[PDB]
C-alpha cells in the first residue's frame, strides 16, 4: 500500500492526485482521498480501481482544502478488494481519519478490547480501522480543548504499546492538524518534505517513497524515524517527538528488492544501487559456483529484474539481451457463457523475443519466486522460443515464510520453497539450473549503501520476525481472513 | 422524506427496495439502505437519485441480512442536494444507524452541546446526524452489555428531552435490533406492522406510510404513538414503551392536503376520504361565497386535486372535465454553449387540453399555493387555451409561515401569500377570482375520519407552531443553512 | 412507438428530448435522437431505456443542427430491448435517416429483394431498417443533383407501392431536407405543425401525436393525409404532395382506446372524449344488460379508465371511488441469489385501498383483458381487500387476433378471448361477472367526434386486416423473431451476471 | 493506429481484444471490435479509452463469430479523440466493415468523387471512411452473386490505382470472408499467420505487428507484401494476387526507431536489433565528433531508448544508468477553478534520480526531438538535479518535414529542427552540446537486418515523399481539419463543465 499526507497553504486535491499516481505501483486495486474543507469537515472520494479512474472531476470538485490524506491499496488479508478501501475515518472525538501501509499482527486481541473497554465497533476486517480506533481511543482520554501536540504525541505513544505489527501512518485530527508516525522497528517507509512558499509560509507533506515529494517540488527532509511521530499544525507549525521505547531500524528488505520504485531513497538507501548491488553479488555467486556451465546470454524478467541482470551479465562477462518484453497493457479474460475457458496463462503479461533464445543456453534473472507456478511457466516459454538450457538465478533468497507485516503473500503452503531444497524446487519448476542470492549477500547489497543500518526485516526469507509475536496459531487466524477474503470477492463476480 | 425498517426473518434487501418504491413520491433527491449482515456489520448504498437508480445488482448483492432500514429523501434546508444523504452511522457505542424524517429545532444548540462535552463532531449539516448523535451519546452512558430494553428506552427519552422539533425516525443497533420512535407531538407520521411467518416467527415493520406495509403483504398494526417508542429484538421480540412527556397527537395537516398517498391512513385517517372532505366543504364555500359568479366547467391541477375538484363540481353542480394532463415524464434542460434561456416555463409539466377551455369561464382546482409562480403560469395556459373567466380555488388555506418540521418551503420573503390578502394574490397571479379554504373547514374535514384529534400543526397556515422554540432568530439560521445549501449546489454544476 | 421531426431555424436538440418526453408513454424501451449540423453530417445518439437516461449533456452536446429527428420505441419482435434501436441511417445515396412507427407485413419478401437486386444487406431484425433501404434504393436511380422535390416524390411514391403494413414515417436527406409520409390506409398516427419566428421564417414539425406540438407552442396544422408526403427544405420551404394510390383513411382504434394520451386529437377526435363517449355506451350496456345486479361503487383500475368508470357511474348512478391506486414507480426485481419475494407481482403495479373495498358489490373497470392473468389477479386483490362480489367491464371488445401495424400484442394462443365465450373468460379468471364493449358501441363511440371517419383499424377485434397480407406463415415468421429476440435478450443478462 | 483481423473457426472476440492489448501502445485513444456473427450480421463495440475499457462483459457477449477484426487509434487529424473511432461498415453491397493504419493523401479528392459520381457521403472526417467506401464502390460493379476471389482482388487493385498515400488495411465481407492489403510502397506493417487446429481446419490472422501473432499463438508465415492482397474465405482458404504495379518495399523508418514493440520483426527486422544497431553508429558519430568532449555517465531517456544507450555507453567504454524513470501512470489534470498547480508538465512523465546526475557531465538520449520543448525541459531537469554539462544524443535524424503516412505528427513550422542547424536548436534548447543521428547510418543501421531493403520511407527526415502528392493544398487540407477537431474536443470539455 502506499500513503499521502499533504498539510499545506492553497488546495491539496490535485498534489495529493498526482502523489499517489506515482505511488501507483504500491497498490492497485483501490484508491482513497480526504481533505479537511474551509468548514472543518472531512470530505471523502474512495473506490476500487487505479488512481485515474477512481477520481473524476466531480469528485475533485469535492475535495476542497489544503490538507488531506491519500492511500493506495494493494489487496492483503483482512483488505481484500471486495472490502471498504481507506482511508477511513471516526467522527469522535474530535473527527479523524487514518491510511495506513502495514499490517497489526494482535488485530484479533485489540479488536475484542476496543468492544469490551471501550464499547467500539468495527466494521471491517481492515486493521486500518482497527489502528484508527486505538489512537481515537486514546486521543478521547482528553478533556480540554484543543489538544496540545504533547496530548497527541502521548495518544501515540500510548497507541505503540498497544499494537503490533509494522505501519506507516498518515492521519488528519479535525480542528488540529496532521500526524504521522512509523513503527518502532522502522519496517515500513515514511518520509518527510516540505516545500517553502515564502517567509512566513511553508507546506509539509509525507509518503511512502521519495519520489512523490519529488514529483511534486517537495524538498526531501528526511526519513520518519523509527517510533517518531510529526505532528503539523493547521498553522503550519512542525513538530516531532520519538513515540517509541527503544526504536531500532530494521528496514524491510523487499522494498529493495522488489516492491519500491527504483528512484526512491529509502532509509538514505538508493533503491536503484541497492538493486545493482544485488546483480553484482548474484553475478559473483554464479561465476564461482557455475563456472562450468556454458551461458550464452544472460535474459530478465522484466521490468524489475533489467539492471539487475545487466550487472550479472557485466560480472559474467556475457552479453545481455531483452529476450522477454512486458506487456504494458494487460486486460481481463471474460467468461462469456460457454465458449473457451483459457485462463492463467503468462503469455498475457510476457512475449518472448524468439530470436533472442534461439538455440542458446540461457540465463533468466527474475527478483523472486513465490509460487513458481509463474516461472515454470516462463521456462517454458524460453524453450518454445528455441533456448537449450534454462537456468534461473533469483535476486532475493528462497522465500520460505509468510510475510505479516504488509507485504501480500501467499500462506507458506503455496510457497514452492517451504519445505523443499533447490534442486527439488528446480525440478517441480521445469529448470536445468537454479540459484538463488544468499541472505547474506542480499543484507550486504543493502547496507553497501548506508552501513548504520545493522539488521533488516528478514521475515520471509529466514523465519526471524521481530515483533515476536507469530505462532503457528496466528498463522491460522490469517488463514480464515484469506479464506473470508476469497468468498466477499467470489460474492461479487456472482453479481 | 420517507423511511422504512423490517426486522425480518429472511433477507430484506429487495422488500426494503420495495418499500422504498412506494414512498417514493415522499422523497426523490436521495434514497439509502443499510442493512446488519450475519457478521453483525453495517452494510450500506446510498446515493442521490432515484430508488430505481440508486441500487443496481451489485449493491443489493452487498445488502445481506434479515434487519433492514431505508430512507428516501426530499431535499430540505441543511440536507441539499449536493449534501450526503441517509442514512448515517456511527461506530460506537455499538454501532448504530438512523433514517429521519422531520426537522429539529434546535439543531445548532445541539451540535454546540456534542461538540463541547462528547467531543462528537458532525461531519454535514444534516439534523438527522445530530439526532443520530444525540441517541448514540446516551447510548453510551450504559457499561453492561449487551443492552436491555429499558436502558434503550431510557436513552430515547433521554433524546426526547433533549432534541426538539418533529421527528419519526427508524434506527439499528448491532447486537440489539430495530427502534423506532416518534416525536411528542405526533406531527411526523409512523406506522407499525407484522407478518406472520410461522408460529414461532413474526417479521415487523415500519413505515412512514401504510402503503408500504400493503406493498409487502404486512398486516397493519396501528400508529406509532406520539412519543411511544418501538424495541425489536433481533430474535424477534416486540417492546413498547411510552418515551416522551405529556405526548399529545398533533399531526401534520400537509400530509393530508398534499403530500402523503391517498391510499395512506396516517392516525386513523383515510387520506383519501380527507380529500374528498375538503372537496366537499370547498365546493359548498364556492357556492356560498361564488353563487353570482358564471363558472361553465371544474377543472384540476392533476394529479392530487383531481378528486378534490371532482366533489367540488358534483356540489357546485357543474361539468367535471380533464383540461389539464400532468406529464408523467419530465426531463432535463440543458445549458449547451449557445443555449436557449427559456427553462421556467411549466408547459414541462402540464399540457391543457385545448377544447376543455375555448369559450368556457373555467374554475380551476390547485391544492395549494405556495411561490405563486406556478399558480400565474397555469392561469395563463388555460387563456391561452380560450378561456375566458378564469377562477382558482386552493384545497389548503394560505400558506403564510415556513415549515420547520419536515416539509421543505421557501422562506416567508417567497410566500406570495406573506403580507398580502386574497385579493392582491388574486391580482399578481392573474386572476379573475381566487379563493382559499378555510382552516377550520380543513380541519374539519380530516378530523371527520377521526374525531379524536383534537389539534392539528397548522404552522404554515396561522404560525403557531406547537413547539414553542421558533422565533425569527431561529429563522435566520435556517437562512444560513440554504444560503451554503446553494453554494454546494453552485459548485457542482460548475 | 412515438416520432417527432423538426425543421427549425435553431437548433433543435432540447427541442427534440422534450417532444419525446411527452411522447414517452408511446415506448419506454429504448430512444433516438438524429441531427444534421452545420457540416451536413449527421449526429446520432440512441440506447436502450428511457428518455431522461438515454441522452446525457455530452450526447447533447454532439447532436448540434437546427433540424432532426427522433424516436421512442415499444419493445416488440425483430425490435427487441437487447437489439438496435432506431433512428437508422445509410449513407448512400446522398445520406439518409429515418424513424417509424408501424410495421411491414411483407418484411420477408423485401429482405429477399434488396439482397438480390441492390445488393443490400439488412443488419438487423427491424422492419424500419427495411424501409430505410427500400426509400434508399428509389432515391439511388437519379443521376442529376440536387435532387427536385419531384424526384424526392416520386421515390416515396416507388416505396409505397413496393411496401405493405402500416406506417407513419420521418426521415431527413442531407443537402435536401426533411420528409414525412404516412401509410395509404392512414392507420398510424402522424400531425403537422409550424412556428412562425418572423414573416421570413417558419418552423415545421411532424409528431406522432398533437401534445408534442402543444409541448412546444407549434401551432396545430392538420394530420398527414394517408399517403400523403411532406417534404420540407433545408431553406424552410414546404411541399406537399399525395404519394399513394387509393388513400384511404383507416386511423387505428387502440390509439383512442388506450395508447394514446387523452389530450392528444388523432384526426380530429379527442382521445379524452372518445374514453368519456366509451363509458357512456358501456354504463349504457351495462345498466341495460346488468338490471338486476346489486353495484355498490365503480373502481377503475387506473391510470387509463378513471374517466371511463366516472361516466360508467353516472350512467348507473352509482358512486365512484378511487379504489386501486396505481404505484407510480416500480423497480427492478433483482435475480438474487437463493431469495424469495415476499411481493406479488400485482402490488408491483398497484396497492388497494382497504376501505373502499370492504363489504362491496364492486364493479372494477379496465381498458382492456389481453392475457386474463393480470385481470385474475386484480380481482383476486379486490376479493382479500373485502369486497363480497367483484365484476369486471372492459373498454373494449373482447382482443382476439394480434396486431402486425405497430401495436406489440401476444399471439393468438395467448389472447383468453381466443376461441373462448365471455362467460368462459368470466370462470377462469375468477369474476363474479364480466362484460364487454361491443366493436360497434366502440366505434360509435370515436366516429361521434369526427363522422367523416367511415372505418377503423379493427383487426384485434375482429380479424379483418386492411393490407389482406396477414396469414399463418407471416405470424411463424414473427414467433421466430420473438424466440431469437427472447434468446438475445437472455443472453445479455446471463453476461451481466459477472 | 494497429489493426488486428482472425478469420477463425471458434469465438475470435477475446482473441481479438488480447491482440489489441499487446497492440495498445499503437494507439490508446479509441477501440474497436466488429465480428460476423452466425447470421451474417456484423456486431460491434466501439468507443473511446483504452481497450480495457472500452469493452465490457456486455460488449463481449456481443461479439459473437469466428470472424472479426479489430482497431486502435491514435488520435490524429480528421480522427480525433471526440470523433467516431473505427472500424466503420457500410452495409452495401453485401455488407463491408474495414480498418486501416495508414493516411489518404488524396482524401480531399477521393471524397469529391464519391460524392458526384455514386452519390457516396462521408459522414465524418476519418480517411478511413473513405477507404472503405472506395473500396465498397468498386465491389458494386459485379452485380453476379457470389462474388468471386478475383472480383475481389480487381476491386482491390482498382482501389489502389484510386488512392494514394500510406495503408495496412484489414475488411470483412459479409457472406465471403476477409482481405488484407498493404501500399503499393510497403510503408505501414502488416503480417500474415497462421494456427492449425487439424488437418483440415486452419486459422488464420493479420496484424500490425508479429507480437499480436506471438500473443496468441499463431505461427509467422510472411509480411503481406507491398501491393499485394490476402484474401481469406469463411471457409478457410488463403488465396493471394498482386494488386498494384511497381509494388516496391519502403518501409516507415518510425516504426523502427519508437513506434513498433522492439520484440515485433517488421519485413524480417527486428525492432530490438535496429535499435541495437542505432546505438552502436550513434556511439561510433560520438567517439569520433566528441573525442574531446568528458562524459561522466549515458543516461537513457525511457523507455523507448534503454537499449540505445546501452549500446552507446558500450561503443564509448563508459557507464550506463538509469537517471531517469519514467511514471508508469500519469493521469489527468482537472480543470481546476482558482487553482495553481504544484507540478511541472515534465515531472508528470518523467522523474529524476538525483545521485545519477550531481556534479557529472551527463549524456542524455532519447529517440527523436520533435517540438524540443520537451527536450528542453529534460535537460533542465538535469540541471536541476545537479548535473554540470548536460548533452543530448537523439537516435534520430533532424525531424524536419511533417509524416503524413499514419504516424501522427505537428506542422512542419512546430518542428524545431525545421530550417534551423544543429547548433541553434543546441542553444534554443540549452543544450551544452546536441547531436543527431546521420540518416545514413540509421538506415544502414536497420539494413543491417535485412539487406533486401533498398530504400525506407524518410520523409520526415529528408522531405522525400513517395507517393509524390503531398503538396501545400494537401497541408491546409490537413491543418483545416485539425481546426475543426480541436473545436470539438472543446465542445466536450465545455459541456462536462457545465
Ligand atoms: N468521440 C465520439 N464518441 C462517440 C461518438 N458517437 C458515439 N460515441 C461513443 O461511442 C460509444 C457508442 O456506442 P453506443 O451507441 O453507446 O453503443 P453500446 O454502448 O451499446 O456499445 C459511446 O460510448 P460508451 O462507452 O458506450 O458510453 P455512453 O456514452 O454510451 O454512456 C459513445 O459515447 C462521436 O461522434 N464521437
Ligand atoms: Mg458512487
Ligand atoms: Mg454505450
Same mark, same amino acid.
Given at each position: 500500500?502506499?500513503?499521502?499526507?499533504?498539510?499545506?497553504?492553497?488546495?491539496?486535491?490535485?498534489?495529493?492526485?498526482?502523489?499517489?499516481?506515482?505511488?501507483?505501483?504500491?497498490?492497485?486495486?483501490?484508491?482513497?482521498?480526504?481533505?479537511?474543507?474551509?468548514?472543518?469537515?472531512?470530505?471523502?472520494?474512495?473506490?476500487?480501481?487505479?488512481?485515474?479512474?477512481?477520481?473524476?472531476?466531480?469528485?475533485?470538485?469535492?475535495?476542497?482544502?489544503?490538507?488531506?490524506?491519500?492511500?493506495?491499496?494493494?489487496?492483503?488479508?483482512?483488505?481484500?478488494?471486495?472490502?471498504?478501501?481507506?482511508?477511513?475515518?471516526?467522527?469522535?472525538?474530535?473527527?479523524?481519519?487514518?491510511?495506513?501501509?502495514?499490517?497489526?499482527?494482535?488485530?484479533?486481541?485489540?479488536?475484542?478490547?476496543?468492544?469490551?473497554?471501550?464499547?467500539?465497533?468495527?466494521?471491517?476486517?481492515?486493521?486500518?480501522?482497527?489502528?484508527?480506533?486505538?489512537?481515537?481511543?486514546?486521543?478521547?482520554?482528553?478533556?480540554?480543548?484543543?489538544?496540545?501536540?504533547?496530548?497527541?504525541?502521548?495518544?501515540?505513544?500510548?497507541?505503540?504499546?498497544?499494537?503490533?505489527?509494522?505501519?506507516?501512518?498518515?492521519?488528519?485530527?479535525?480542528?488540529?492538524?496532521?500526524?504521522?508516525?512509523?513503527?518502532?522497528?522502522?519496517?515500513?517507509?515514511?518520509?518527510?518534505?516540505?516545500?517553502?512558499?515564502?517567509?512566513?509560509?511553508?507546506?509539509?507533506?509525507?509518503?511512502?517513497?521519495?519520489?512523490?515529494?519529488?514529483?511534486?517540488?517537495?524538498?526531501?527532509?528526511?526519513?520518519?524515524?523509527?517510533?517518531?511521530?510529526?505532528?503539523?499544525?493547521?498553522?503550519?507549525?512542525?513538530?516531532?517527538?520519538?513515540?517509541?521505547?527503544?526504536?531500532?531500524?530494521?528496514?524491510?528488505?523487499?522494498?529493495?528488492?522488489?516492491?519500491?520504485?527504483?528512484?526512491?531513497?529509502?532509509?538514505?538507501?538508493?533503491?536503484?544501487?541497492?538493486?545493482?548491488?544485488?546483480?553484482?553479488?548474484?553475478?559473483?555467486?554464479?561465476? #564461482?559456483?557455475?563456472?562450468? @556451465?556454458?551461458? &550464452?546470454?544472460? %535474459?530478465?524478467?522484466?521490468? !524489475? /529484474?533489467?539492471? *539487475?541482470?545487466?550487472?550479472?551479465?557485466?560480472?559474467?562477462?556475457?552479453?545481455?539481451?531483452?529476450?522477454?518484453?512486458?506487456?504494458?497493457?494487460?486486460?481481463?479474460?471474460?467468461?462469456?457463457?460457454?465458449?473457451?475457458?483459457?485462463?492463467?496463462?503468462?503469455?498475457?503479461?510476457?512475449?518472448?523475443?524468439?530470436?533472442?533464445? #534461439?538455440?542458446?543456453?540461457? @540465463?533468466?534473472? &527474475?527478483?523472486? %519466486?513465490?509460487?513458481?507456478? !509463474? /516461472?515454470?511457466? *516462463?521456462?517454458?516459454?524460453?524453450?518454445?522460443?528455441?533456448?537449450?538450457?534454462?537456468?534461473?538465478?533469483?535476486?532475493?533468497?528462497?522465500?520460505?515464510?509468510?510475510?505479516?507485516?504488509?507485504?501480500?503473500?501467499?500462506?507458506?503452503?503455496?510457497?514452492?520453497?517451504?519445505?523443499?531444497?533447490?534442486?527439488?524446487?528446480?525440478?517441480?519448476?521445469?529448470?536445468?539450473?537454479?540459484?538463488?542470492?544468499?541472505?547474506?549477500?542480499?543484507?550486504?547489497?543493502?547496507?553497501?549503501?548506508?552501513?548504520?543500518?545493522?539488521?533488516?526485516?528478514?521475515?520471509?526469507?529466514?523465519?526471524?520476525?521481530?515483533?515476536?509475536?507469530?505462532?503457528?496459531?496466528?498463522?491460522?487466524?490469517?488463514?480464515?481472513?484469506?479464506?473470508?477474503?476469497?468468498?466477499?470477492?467470489?460474492?461479487?463476480?456472482?453479481?
Amino acid at each position: 500500500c502506499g500513503i499521502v499526507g499533504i498539510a499545506g497553504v492553497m488546495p491539496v486535491n490535485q498534489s495529493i492526485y498526482d502523489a499517489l499516481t506515482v505511488l501507483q505501483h504500491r497498490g492497485q486495486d483501490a484508491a482513497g482521498i480526504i481533505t479537511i474543507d474551509a468548514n472543518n469537515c472531512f470530505r471523502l472520494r474512495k473506490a476500487n480501481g487505479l488512481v485515474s479512474d477512481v477520481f473524476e472531476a466531480r469528485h475533485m470538485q469535492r475535495l476542497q482544502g489544503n490538507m488531506g490524506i491519500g492511500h493506495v491499496r494493494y489487496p492483503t488479508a483482512g483488505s481484500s478488494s471486495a472490502s471498504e478501501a481507506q482511508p477511513f475515518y471516526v467522527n469522535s472525538p474530535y473527527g479523524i481519519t487514518l491510511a495506513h501501509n502495514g499490517n497489526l499482527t494482535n488485530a484479533h486481541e485489540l479488536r475484542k478490547k476496543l468492544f469490551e473497554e471501550k464499547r467500539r465497533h468495527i466494521n471491517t476486517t481492515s486493521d486500518s480501522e482497527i489502528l484508527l480506533n486505538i489512537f481515537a481511543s486514546e486521543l478521547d482520554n482528553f478533556r480540554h480543548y484543543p489538544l496540545e501536540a504533547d496530548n497527541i504525541f502521548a495518544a501515540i505513544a500510548a497507541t505503540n504499546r498497544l499494537i503490533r505489527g509494522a505501519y506507516a501512518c498518515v492521519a488528519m485530527i479535525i480542528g488540529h492538524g496532521m500526524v504521522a508516525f512509523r513503527d518502532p522497528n522502522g519496517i515500513r517507509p515514511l518520509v518527510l518534505g516540505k516545500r517553502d512558499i515564502d517567509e512566513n509560509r511553508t507546506e509539509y507533506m509525507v509518503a511512502s517513497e521519495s519520489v512523490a515529494l519529488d514529483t511534486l517540488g517537495f524538498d526531501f527532509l528526511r526519513d520518519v524515524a523509527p517510533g517518531e511521530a510529526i505532528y503539523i499544525t493547521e498553522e503550519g507549525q512542525l513538530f516531532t517527538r520519538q513515540c517509541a521505547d527503544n526504536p531500532v531500524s530494521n528496514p524491510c528488505l523487499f522494498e529493495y528488492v522488489y516492491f519500491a520504485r527504483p528512484d526512491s531513497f529509502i532509509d538514505k538507501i538508493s533503491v536503484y544501487s541497492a538493486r545493482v548491488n544485488m546483480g553484482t553479488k548474484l553475478g559473483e555467486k554464479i561465476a #564461482r559456483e557455475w563456472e562450468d @556451465l556454458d551461458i &550464452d546470454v544472460v %535474459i530478465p524478467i522484466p521490468e !524489475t /529484474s533489467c539492471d *539487475i541482470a545487466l550487472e550479472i551479465a557485466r560480472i559474467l562477462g556475457k552479453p545481455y539481451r531483452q529476450g522477454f518484453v512486458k506487456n504494458r497493457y494487460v486486460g481481463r479474460t471474460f467468461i462469456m457463457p460457454g465458449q473457451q475457458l483459457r485462463r492463467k496463462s503468462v503469455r498475457r503479461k510476457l512475449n518472448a523475443n524468439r530470436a533472442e533464445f #534461439r538455440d542458446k543456453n540461457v @540465463l533468466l534473472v &527474475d527478483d523472486s %519466486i513465490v509460487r513458481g507456478t !509463474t /516461472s515454470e511457466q *516462463i521456462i517454458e516459454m524460453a524453450r518454445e522460443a528455441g533456448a537449450k538450457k534454462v537456468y534461473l538465478a533469483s535476486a532475493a533468497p528462497e522465500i520460505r515464510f509468510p510475510n505479516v507485516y504488509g507485504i501480500d503473500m501467499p500462506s507458506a503452503t503455496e510457497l514452492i520453497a517451504h519445505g523443499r531444497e533447490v534442486d527439488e524446487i528446480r525440478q517441480i519448476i521445469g529448470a536445468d539450473g537454479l540459484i538463488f542470492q544468499d541472505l547474506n549477500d542480499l543484507i550486504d547489497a543493502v547496507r553497501a549503501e548506508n552501513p548504520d543500518i545493522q539488521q533488516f526485516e528478514c521475515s520471509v526469507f529466514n523465519g526471524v520476525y521481530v515483533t515476536k509475536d507469530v505462532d503457528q496459531g496466528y498463522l491460522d487466524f490469517l488463514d480464515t481472513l484469506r479464506n473470508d477474503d476469497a468468498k466477499a470477492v467470489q460474492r461479487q463476480n456472482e453479481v
